[PDB]
Amino acid sequence: RRWQWRMKKLG
């Protein structure tokens, strides 16, 4: 993963 998001991309 390019980072450690959670659900920011989803929308």
Number of strands: 0
Question: Major β-sheet, in short?
Answer: none
- Regarding quaternary structure, how should these chains be classified? monomer
Cα Rg: 7 Å
Shape: elongated
**So how many helices?**
0
Class per helix and strand makeup: little secondary structure
Helix percent band: under 10%
Percentage of β-strand residues: under 5%
Query: Distance between the terminal alpha carbons, to the nearest Å?
Result: 18 Å
PDB class: transport protein
Keywords: Micelle-bound, transport protein
Assembly: monomeric
Entry title: The structure of a lactoferricinB derivative bound to micelles (LfcinB4-14)
Keywords summarizing the entry:
11 residues, transport protein, Micelle-bound, monomeric
Structure description:
By secondary structure, the chain is low in regular secondary structure. It is 0% helix and 0% strand. The chain contains no helices and no strands. It is elongated, with a radius of gyration of 7 Å. The N and C termini lie far apart (18 Å).
